[PDB]
Design an enzyme around this catalytic site. Structure first.
Site, mmCIF file in Angstrom:
data_model
loop_
_atom_site.group_PDB
_atom_site.id
_atom_site.type_symbol
_atom_site.label_atom_id
_atom_site.label_comp_id
_atom_site.label_asym_id
_atom_site.label_seq_id
_atom_site.Cartn_x
_atom_site.Cartn_y
_atom_site.Cartn_z
ATOM 1 N N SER A 117 -14.183 -6.694 -23.472
ATOM 2 C CA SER A 117 -15.056 -7.497 -24.490
ATOM 3 C C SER A 117 -16.501 -7.197 -23.897
ATOM 4 O O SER A 117 -16.973 -6.804 -22.687
ATOM 5 C CB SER A 117 -14.476 -9.050 -24.390
ATOM 6 O OG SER A 117 -14.666 -9.470 -23.215
ATOM 7 N N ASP A 166 -20.180 -9.749 -23.642
ATOM 8 C CA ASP A 166 -20.831 -11.065 -23.765
ATOM 9 C C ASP A 166 -22.283 -10.799 -24.479
ATOM 10 O O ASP A 166 -23.092 -9.777 -23.861
ATOM 11 C CB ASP A 166 -21.159 -11.678 -22.420
ATOM 12 C CG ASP A 166 -19.915 -12.497 -21.790
ATOM 13 O OD1 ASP A 166 -18.826 -12.763 -22.585
ATOM 14 O OD2 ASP A 166 -19.771 -12.753 -20.715
ATOM 15 N N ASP A 181 -14.334 -26.950 -27.307
ATOM 16 C CA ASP A 181 -12.821 -26.208 -27.143
ATOM 17 C C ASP A 181 -11.685 -26.939 -26.504
ATOM 18 O O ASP A 181 -10.654 -26.714 -26.254
ATOM 19 C CB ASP A 181 -12.834 -24.630 -26.809
ATOM 20 C CG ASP A 181 -11.671 -23.904 -27.665
ATOM 21 O OD1 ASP A 181 -11.392 -23.921 -28.439
ATOM 22 O OD2 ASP A 181 -10.997 -23.275 -26.781
#
Ligand code: NA
EC number: 3.2.1.17
Length: 129
Positions: free
Chosen positions: A50, A52, A101
């Site tokens: 991934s 950022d 979250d």
């Protein structure tokens, strides 16, 4: 864009981050300092493949689409490139979803390791807010 510390504090306040989910403005400014050094164009590759993005280093694994993070999600419904803009609206909108979250600002490992428990009010010191 490389924001000034008070410039970024003002922008974050205007977009309603100050005391969002109970996190005072200095927490957000502190997270931004250690995530991005206040650079909207900051990108960093994670070990998992991934990336950022932007002032708050929002991760393509869950939050934005970058087309190269297999098995990932786009919970903020935005291209990751939108998180590099000089206008921090999209980063702030997405950061509000992240901090909601369930783990608050622990989602940002640099906040937990470098801001949590510290004198975060220092980060808005001298600012005309
Ligand atoms: Na993604």
């Amino acid at each position: 864009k490389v924001f000034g510390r008070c410039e970024l504090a003002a922008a974050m306040k205007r977009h309603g981050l100050d005391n969002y989910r109970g996190y005072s403005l200095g927490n957000w400014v502190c997270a931004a300092k250690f995530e991005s050094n206040f650079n909207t164009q900051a990108t960093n590759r994670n070990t998992d493949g991934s990336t950022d993005y932007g002032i708050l280093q929002i991760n393509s694994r869950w939050w934005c689409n970058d087309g190269r993070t297999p098995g990932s999600r786009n919970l903020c419904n935005i291209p990751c490139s939108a998180l590099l803009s000089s206008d921090i609206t999209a980063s702030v909108n997405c950061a509000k979803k992240i901090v909601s979250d369930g783990n608050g600002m622990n989602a940002w490992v640099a906040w937990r390791n470098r801001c949590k428990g510290t004198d975060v009010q220092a980060w808005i010191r001298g600012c005309r807010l």
